[PDB]
Symmetry: D2
Subunit: 311 residues, 4 copies
């Protein structure tokens, strides 16, 4: 409504979350361990195109799991809900089944878990080599960001692949259970998966991608239709219930917004018909979510009444 | 917007769902088995007070599990979110842990499962006898329905109590795990629980209760504040993710509205800032939800674009 | 072989286990908490009738779970293997399913877990009242002990019943799943169960009961046939794999003898065609087994080569 | 005792089991599918060296899972109980955890499951290449069989490796959880594993290997010490509780002998201080055990009273 006054509250919330110094920076690969715990950035892009940034918003970092809802949207956009959900489920697994790769029907629980993102990766642009598949997804992310920063980290790619024994275990398990479409080169799909995890954004460019999802699939800084209404609706439902790892249920109850976190410390946040946001702070909590970002999200809903069922 | 034209679409959807004759009427007690499979009613109450009914909308039936979100709302209204959630969790259990009474922290998964509703019943109006507790809840349901039909089935009460061995197993298990507030007479709480399950409504009176939840806790036919905004928001989040038994996840994805089903064939449905509805048809599917009601809900969201993340 | 020299090794092992002061005396009821941690007794009865005792062997204590294999033997003796195993399974549950009352077929895992012992109690001497059922089992235990000390603790009975909420949860759960024979008064079976748990023995009398199982069902101090060969064989197989709570698998691997522990600190031990033993020391470890008794059993197999697969 | 008369009962039991035509020959690789359902052989080797064969006892088939207890014995023989069980557990998993690769302590449940056999394979003769490791195990199996038929199927090896996606998923999962000794080439260990599964025996040569285990680790046809008493005792305990897949618990209760089945239809059976046996019939039941072999084992214990706890 009054954008100038709203940005002052964003700056206040940014400053309050800055004092929250807890957490541990992810250190399983040296490309994540490198990062300073003090980096903290918040970028907002409204559905009308209004922008606002505070902090470290032009420093590139990997999307990691923040790419999961984006490639799911691309798959539904090109293939439809029915085809995509023959290979992947549509609900959270719960704390009891959080270590199992598949559900009762031999399908990955949802697109937001590793097994589900690996199957979704196998459905995109079938029939062409990995170079063409990667270019096709980059072309799509550039439209979602309004041609803003979309890069690639080769160091992260080489490190994820050399140390991803758990993902290779998922790959061979999905192959044994017939989870992939026929004629899938599983090892090549894992390569394409590690490449998508290694795509780099800034808070500024990623907030535009979140504002595309908040604006019914239309990029707000170009006015271009990028995703179908069906792809956007399905991505937002699954971000609301499955996007914050084992904290998804607490986040749906207290925050009630579609969001997705990554191991780099990013939280892609969507406020439907209002704005898109990207919070980034490398230190993660026990659940794997950014400590500063989680604090910021709780304060944002309390102050601005953005929760789905807020009156 | 144009109420007259909207009711014609409700009548069309009612007629389309009427042809769906599948399902089985619940028969574990004779009071549920009695019911005709052909009974089918739909009542709408908007947040402005506009009413519309089609079918068997003045035939009383028991709320059964449809009372779970209502007593949860009363508990949060009187005690607050923090106190209530020391005893009960706030998320779905999943298909893996659908037979366990408690979660990792020795708490019932959420207020929408039997163990959770039993603990919530133990928190309401503590310190008084069951007659006063029952009157207090009836007084609250009468305000939610705008003084419309709220009755009681003694036959259902006596039958639920004489055959509820599973609920008695939950009661003793919660007592062993220290799930109740100190000085709780567990057997007396089970009695109060069977009584609340036996409360009778019509489609007409129950649609007013659903419209109270759709209107920020204000009854639309009286203008009286019945529930606090905090109680309404929490009830709607848990109805969205836990309200349709093992179908909750499919319903959140395809329908995306807060709803709650019961073994009598009722589906209490909320469309925030628009209306409240009660669908009722005794035959249930394998998941325990009304066959006609589930069909009606899917058609309603497709036609009127009421899904949470619909643009 | 040379009994005099063998008793000197028993006295040495007794003295070595005496130095092992770890553990905690069970304190859930005051009748168990009363007990001194320093009480330690070992009694041996060979299949030929040779006796030897060291320590506190004439102090009465409750059998508790040590009665589970004894009532199972009585059930198989009177009804046969086929009838008994229509109601109860015949294998360990494992660490994953150690909190579930039933297995995949809606049956208790084995007679050595609480749910299984409750179902076995429901099969003994059906058609008569609890006073006659109790007398019938006492008559049987007196034959197993060669008319040596078999008493009853009323204080333990009243305390087990007043605080056994977990057993009442099992009782109502088994009733819901149709686990009992038709026309079973479940509450009366729980009463009979608490009574059997409260039967008192000494190390001396209990070693005779273990020597009856070691001697093919013939009491070694009377020569009387008490149990059928089929009842003895089935009891010994289930004591070998299910008798030491969550330590059953480690005990089968390192000790390899049929044994059964109880919360009073007793370990009923059988060495087939050699002898029966009862070790008793109130302090229990994290698994619920007597610390001194477990130490003694490990030393006994190492020294005398009694393990099933020892050459 | 009277060998001539005993062989007549073996011939009678062979003839009775021959009429049991149920089951399905394993068909996941063409090398198993090839096999006739009518092949049925029984070979006996006593601890004194007495031999007897009936049926198809000189037709070679792969050991498959029948090699699991043999390589476990070799590992304990060379490294001891303590070192081996730092990497692998010592008990059955149960029906609830029959699809999980690891137990509560991030270790494979026991050496008789695929994950456990893969870890055991990683412990044998470390520091040398796969050709030397394979020769070392062949040298050991030749001593166990008294220099009787021990071959190799290259076709089975190439087929197991090309289609073993589940074993590759186990391999990468064990690598992620740090289950192998440091500096393990996991892919090379999987190769060595597929090679050991492809070793070929006849009923005659395999009954000598089972008689080595029945004779305290001394080969009965040569008198040579092959395995240590500790290796034999540990192998027999784990064959008794974990050797017949999901039927292990029913087999321990009804048969009570150490045994191990394989997908080729073989059942390696040990009667301690009496004899070793190998039953072979390609058609398997739902549990994966040979239909004729299971029938034969039940008849053998009933007739000759060989059950561990038989008087
Ligand atoms: C399907 O048949 C059984 C099955 O469901 N048996 C059950 N036995 N007891 C049950 N419920 C208890 C009541 C309280 N329960 C807990 C425990 C811990 C925490 N909260 N609650 C346990 S369910 C099964 C399926 C699959 C795998 C193994 C077993
Ligand atoms: C906590 O330590 C273990 C534990 O988690 N062990 C695991 N072993 N293997 C695992 N993952 C496999 C990969 C594919 N898996 C399936 C199976 C079936 C369906 N989908 N996926 C199985 S997890 C444990 C905890 C609690 C109780 C028992 C065991």
């Amino acid at each position: 409504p009054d954008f100038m006054s709203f940005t002052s509250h964003i700056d206040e919330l940014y400053e309050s979350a800055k004092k929250q110094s807890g957490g541990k920076v992810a250190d399983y690969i040296p490309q994540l361990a490198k990062f300073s715990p003090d980096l903290w950035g918040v970028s907002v892009c409204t559905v009308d195109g209004q922008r606002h940034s505070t902090g470290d918003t032009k420093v590139p970092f990997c999307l990691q799991s923040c790419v999961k809802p984006l490639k799911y949207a691309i798959a539904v956009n090109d293939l439809g809900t029915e085809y995509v959900h023959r290979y992947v489920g549509k609900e959270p697994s719960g704390l009891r089944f959080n270590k199992l790769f598949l559900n009762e029907d031999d399908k990955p629980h949802n697109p937001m878990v590793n097994a589900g993102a690996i199957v979704v990766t196998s459905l995109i642009k079938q029939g062409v080599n990995n170079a063409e598949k990667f270019d096709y997804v980059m072309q799509f992310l550039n439209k979602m960001a309004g041609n803003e920063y979309v890069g690639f980290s080769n160091a992260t790619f080489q490190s994820e692949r050399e140390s991803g024994d758990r993902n290779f275990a998922i790959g061979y398990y999905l192959k044994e259970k017939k989870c992939f479409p026929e004629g899938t080169d599983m090892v090549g799909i894992l390569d394409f998966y590690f490449q998508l995890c290694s795509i780099e954004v800034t808070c500024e460019s990623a907030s535009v991608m979140a504002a595309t999802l908040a604006n019914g699939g239309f990029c707000p800084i170009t006015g271009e239709r990028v995703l179908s209404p069906e792809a956007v609706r399905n991505t937002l439902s699954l971000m609301h219930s499955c996007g914050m790892y084992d904290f998804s249920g607490q986040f749906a109850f207290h925050v009630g917004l579609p969001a997705k976190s990554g191991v780099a410390g990013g939280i892609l946040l969507v406020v439907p018909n209002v704005m898109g946001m990207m919070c980034w702070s490398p230190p993660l909590d026990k659940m794997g979510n950014s400590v500063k970002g989680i604090h910021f999200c709780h304060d944002l809903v309390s102050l601005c009444n953005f929760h789905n069922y807020d009156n």
